[PDB]
Amino acid sequence: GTIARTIVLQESIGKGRFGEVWRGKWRGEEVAVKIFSSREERSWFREAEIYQTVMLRHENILGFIAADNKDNGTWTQLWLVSDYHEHGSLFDYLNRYTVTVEGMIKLALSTASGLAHLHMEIVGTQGKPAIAHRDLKSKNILVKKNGTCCIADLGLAVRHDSATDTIDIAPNHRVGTKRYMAPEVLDDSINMKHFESFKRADIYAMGLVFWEIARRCSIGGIHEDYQLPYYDLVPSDPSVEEMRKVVCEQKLRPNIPNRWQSCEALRVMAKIMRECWYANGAARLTALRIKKTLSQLSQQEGI
Numbered sequence: 443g444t445i446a447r448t449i450v451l452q453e454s455i456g457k458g459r460f461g462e463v464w465r466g467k468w469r470g471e472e473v474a475v476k477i478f479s480s481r482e483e484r485s486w487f488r489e490a491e492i493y494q495t496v497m498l499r500h501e502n503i504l505g506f507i508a509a510d511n512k513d514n515g516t517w518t519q520l521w522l523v524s525d526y527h528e529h530g531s532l533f534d535y536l537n538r539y540t541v542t543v544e545g546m547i548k549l550a551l552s553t554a555s556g557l558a559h560l561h562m563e564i565v566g567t568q569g570k571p572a573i574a575h576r577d578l579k580s581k582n583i584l585v586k587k588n589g590t591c592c593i594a595d596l597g598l599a600v601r602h603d604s605a606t607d608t609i610d611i612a613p614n615h616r617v618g619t620k621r622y623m624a625p626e627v628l629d630d631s632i633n634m635k636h637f638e639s640f641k642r643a644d645i646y647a648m649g650l651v652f653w654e655i656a657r658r659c660s661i662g663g664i665h666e667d668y669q670l671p672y673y674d675l676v677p678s679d680p681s682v683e684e685m686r687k688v689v690c691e692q693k694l695r696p697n698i699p700n701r702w703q704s705c706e707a708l709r710v711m712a713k714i715m716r717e718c719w720y721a722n723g724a725a726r727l728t729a730l731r732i733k734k735t736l737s738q739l740s741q742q743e744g745i
């Protein structure tokens with residue numbers, strides 16, 4: 443179509459299970475283009491559908507430009523064009539850098555604000571349904587030039603129909619990254635007909651991401667090396683059984699260093715983490731409550 447024909451792909455930057463991400467140039471501006479083959483039309487269409495949800499746009503959700511198709515003369519490529527963020531993922535950013543207390547709060551508050559918007563139902567003619575991500579992780583959050591985050595990779599999301607309390611694609615199977623699966627998803631006790639259960643599972647994953655950020659917060663030159671949650675308990679690319687044994691059976695969570703109690707911002711972050719990690723999803727904080735707590739902390743810090 444008219445957009446793809448004017449885009450020049452400059453570099454393949456990431457390959458995943460669902461499409462390949464390229465850096466391209468559109469109207470002289472850098473854009474990200476996720477490309478799918480003809481046999482991945484269902485994943486491409488579903489991701490285009492989620493990104494076109496009414497009132498979805500928000501500073502902390504990846505800005506979607508358009509879906510399109512490009513025929514090179516041999517085969518067709520299915521495209522999803524979005525904003526490009528040079529820093530890449532929060533995982534890449536946290537591996538490359540340490541952050542200040544201000545930096546950590548900006549990353550955590552922006553992630554929570556994005557998740558609170560995703561989770562929020564807006565009633566009305568131009569209403570927005572509540573959406574649960576189902577695959578939140580540091581590799582799926584991007585970092586903008588201004589040091590704030592935006593949630594991306596919304597292709598596995600589910601949307602709620604509040605009038606009937608049903609889910610648009612009626613999920614019947616586990617999806618997502620095993621390391622970040624909530625206890626109820628690992629032991630298959632989650633009620634997949636209950637939309638609020640998917641929101642609660644996203645909060646557990648956000649707690650893990652907050653732990654990744656807090657390790658990189660450098661105060662007086664003191665910080666931890668970058669690690670994925672559960673690096674100390676499971677192998678790389680862990681199985682559901684490996685994760686379940688640790689999270690559900692042994693009931694372990696990522697370690698919270700004692701020294702995080704010595705700094706008010708780290709104390710607030712550690713308390714949020716614990717309150718995201720409860721085995722009972724109904725006891726977890728909501729994204730809106732986390733946004734409120736961190737906004738109160740950001741104001742206090744003078745960010």
Ligand SMILES: Nc1ccc(-n2ccc(=O)c3c(N)ncnc32)cc1
Nearest residue numbers: 455456463474525526527530531594
């Ligand atoms: N290493 C790495 C990290 C992140 C990405 N990546 C993935 C999906 C995106 O949508 C995206 C984007 N919009 N802007 C910049 N990077 C993006 C690719 C490679």
